[PDB]
Protein backbone atom coordinates (compact mmCIF):
# COMPACT_ATOMS: atom_id res chain seq x y z
CA UNK A 1 0.00 0.00 0.00
CA UNK A 2 1.50 3.36 -1.14
CA UNK A 3 2.47 5.91 1.56
CA UNK A 4 0.11 8.92 1.83
CA UNK A 5 2.04 12.00 0.86
CA UNK A 6 -0.87 14.53 0.82
CA UNK A 7 -1.62 17.06 3.59
CA UNK A 8 -4.75 15.03 4.39
CA UNK A 9 -4.50 12.17 6.93
CA UNK A 10 -5.27 8.67 5.72
CA UNK A 11 -6.91 7.89 9.09
CA UNK A 12 -8.67 11.03 10.48
CA UNK A 13 -10.30 9.02 13.38
CA UNK A 14 -6.71 8.67 14.68
CA UNK A 15 -5.77 12.39 14.33
CA UNK A 16 -6.06 13.16 18.09
CA UNK A 17 -3.26 12.11 20.41
CA UNK A 18 -5.87 10.83 22.92
CA UNK A 19 -7.53 8.59 20.33
CA UNK A 20 -4.13 7.05 19.43
CA UNK A 21 -3.28 6.41 23.11
CA UNK A 22 -6.41 4.26 23.62
CA UNK A 23 -5.35 1.83 20.81
CA UNK A 24 -2.29 0.55 22.77
CA UNK A 25 -3.95 -0.72 25.98
CA UNK A 26 -1.39 -2.31 28.30
CA UNK A 27 1.84 -2.06 26.29
CA UNK A 28 4.70 -4.43 27.22
CA UNK A 29 6.98 -3.40 24.37
CA UNK A 30 10.49 -1.92 24.15
CA UNK A 31 9.25 1.50 23.05
CA UNK A 32 7.17 4.00 25.06
CA UNK A 33 3.49 4.24 23.90
CA UNK A 34 3.25 7.99 24.68
CA UNK A 35 6.36 8.59 22.53
CA UNK A 36 4.82 6.51 19.73
CA UNK A 37 1.49 8.36 19.94
CA UNK A 38 3.33 11.73 19.85
CA UNK A 39 5.12 10.62 16.68
CA UNK A 40 1.68 10.04 15.05
CA UNK A 41 1.46 6.28 15.66
CA UNK A 42 -1.42 4.11 16.85
CA UNK A 43 -1.32 0.38 17.64
CA UNK A 44 -3.03 -2.24 15.47
CA UNK A 45 -3.14 -4.91 18.21
CA UNK A 46 -0.73 -7.11 16.20
CA UNK A 47 2.27 -7.37 18.54
CA UNK A 48 4.14 -4.03 18.47
CA UNK A 49 2.92 -3.05 14.94
CA UNK A 50 1.97 0.64 14.64
CA UNK A 51 0.67 2.78 11.75
CA UNK A 52 0.97 6.53 11.33
CA UNK A 53 -2.55 8.10 11.27
CA UNK A 54 -1.41 10.46 8.52
CA UNK A 55 0.84 8.66 6.01
CA UNK A 56 -0.50 5.16 6.86
CA UNK A 57 3.09 3.99 7.33
CA UNK A 58 3.51 0.77 9.31
CA UNK A 59 6.43 -0.24 11.54
CA UNK A 60 7.14 -3.37 13.65
CA UNK A 61 9.85 -5.10 15.77
CA UNK A 62 10.68 -2.09 17.94
CA UNK A 63 14.09 -2.30 19.59
CA UNK A 64 14.81 -0.22 22.76
CA UNK A 65 17.35 1.90 20.77
CA UNK A 66 14.81 2.74 18.02
CA UNK A 67 13.21 6.16 18.27
CA UNK A 68 9.62 6.63 16.92
CA UNK A 69 10.34 9.98 15.18
CA UNK A 70 13.61 8.80 13.58
CA UNK A 71 11.93 5.61 12.30
CA UNK A 72 8.96 7.64 10.97
CA UNK A 73 11.45 9.79 9.02
CA UNK A 74 13.57 6.80 7.93
CA UNK A 75 10.75 4.80 6.38
CA UNK A 76 8.05 7.45 5.61
CA UNK A 77 10.01 10.59 4.60
CA UNK A 78 7.04 11.91 2.48
CA UNK A 79 4.72 12.07 5.51
CA UNK A 80 3.24 15.54 5.88
CA UNK A 81 2.45 15.10 9.56
CA UNK A 82 6.16 14.34 10.09
CA UNK A 83 7.13 17.48 8.09
CA UNK A 84 4.74 19.64 10.14
CA UNK A 85 5.88 18.34 13.56
CA UNK A 86 9.62 18.04 12.95
CA UNK A 87 10.60 20.25 9.97
CA UNK A 88 12.71 19.36 6.89
CA UNK A 89 16.05 20.22 8.59
CA UNK A 90 15.45 17.47 11.22
CA UNK A 91 14.26 15.20 8.44
CA UNK A 92 17.45 15.76 6.43
CA UNK A 93 19.62 15.24 9.56
CA UNK A 94 17.98 11.86 10.22
CA UNK A 95 18.44 10.73 6.59
CA UNK A 96 21.99 11.89 6.46
CA UNK A 97 22.79 10.07 9.72
CA UNK A 98 21.07 6.82 8.68
CA UNK A 99 22.64 6.89 5.16
CA UNK A 100 26.03 7.54 6.87
CA UNK A 101 25.37 4.75 9.39
CA UNK A 102 25.17 2.39 6.38
CA UNK A 103 28.44 3.49 4.72
CA UNK A 104 30.12 3.17 8.18
CA UNK A 105 29.23 -0.58 8.27
CA UNK A 106 29.22 -1.36 4.49
C1 LIG B 1 10.96 0.22 14.48
C2 LIG B 1 11.79 -0.53 13.45
C3 LIG B 1 11.09 -0.62 12.10
N1 LIG B 1 11.86 -1.42 11.14
C4 LIG B 1 11.33 -1.38 9.77
C5 LIG B 1 9.89 -1.84 9.60
O1 LIG B 1 9.27 -2.35 10.53
N2 LIG B 1 9.33 -1.66 8.36
C6 LIG B 1 10.06 -1.18 7.16
C7 LIG B 1 8.96 -0.79 6.19
C8 LIG B 1 7.75 -1.50 6.72
C9 LIG B 1 6.50 -1.72 6.17
N3 LIG B 1 5.55 -2.39 6.82
C10 LIG B 1 5.83 -2.84 8.03
CL1 LIG B 1 4.55 -3.70 8.83
C11 LIG B 1 7.02 -2.68 8.67
C12 LIG B 1 8.00 -2.00 7.99
C13 LIG B 1 12.09 -2.78 11.64
C14 LIG B 1 12.82 -2.74 12.97
N4 LIG B 1 12.06 -1.92 13.95
ZN1 LIG C 1 3.38 9.51 8.91
Curated annotation (Swiss-Prot):
Annotated stretches, region: Required for interaction with DIABLO: 81-102
Effect listed in the UniProt record for changing residue 62 to A: No effect on interaction with SEPTIN4 isoform ARTS
Binding site for Zn(2+): 52, 55, 72, 79
BIR repeat windows: 17-82
Compartment(s) where it occurs, according to its Swiss-Prot or TrEMBL record: Cytoplasm; Nucleus
Primary role: Multi-functional protein which regulates not only caspases and apoptosis, but also modulates inflammatory signaling and immunity, copper homeostasis, mitogenic kinase signaling, cell proliferation, as well as cell invasion and metastasis. Acts as a direct caspase inhibitor. Directly bind to the active site pocket of CASP3 and CASP7 and obstructs substrate entry. Inactivates CASP9 by keeping it in a monomeric, inactive state.
Swiss-Prot/TrEMBL domain comment: The first BIR domain is involved in interaction with TAB1/MAP3K7IP1 and is important for dimerization. The second BIR domain is sufficient to inhibit CASP3 and CASP7, while the third BIR is involved in CASP9 inhibition. The interactions with DIABLO/SMAC and HTRA2/PRSS25 are mediated by the second and third BIR domains.
Disease: Lymphoproliferative syndrome, X-linked, 2: A rare immunodeficiency characterized by extreme susceptibility to infection with Epstein-Barr virus (EBV). Symptoms include severe or fatal mononucleosis, acquired hypogammaglobulinemia, pancytopenia and malignant lymphoma.
Family affiliation: Belongs to the IAP family.
Subunit structure: Monomer, and homodimer. Part of a complex composed of SEPTIN4 isoform ARTS, XIAP and BCL2, within the complex interacts with SEPTIN4 isoform ARTS and BCL2, SEPTIN4 isoform ARTS acts as a scaffold protein and stabilizes the complex. Interacts (via BIR3 domain) with DIABLO/SMAC; the interaction inhibits apoptotic suppressor activity. Interacts with HTRA2/PRSS25; the interaction inhibits apoptotic suppressor activity. Interacts with TAB1/MAP3K7IP1 and AIFM1. Interaction with DIABLO/SMAC hinders binding of TAB1/MAP3K7IP1 and AIFM1. Interacts with TCF25 and COMMD1.
Protein name (record): E3 ubiquitin-protein ligase XIAP
Organism the protein comes from: Homo sapiens
Amino acid sequence: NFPNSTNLPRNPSMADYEARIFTFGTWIYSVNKEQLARAGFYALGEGDKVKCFHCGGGLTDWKPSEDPWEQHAKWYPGCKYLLEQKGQEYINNIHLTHSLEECLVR
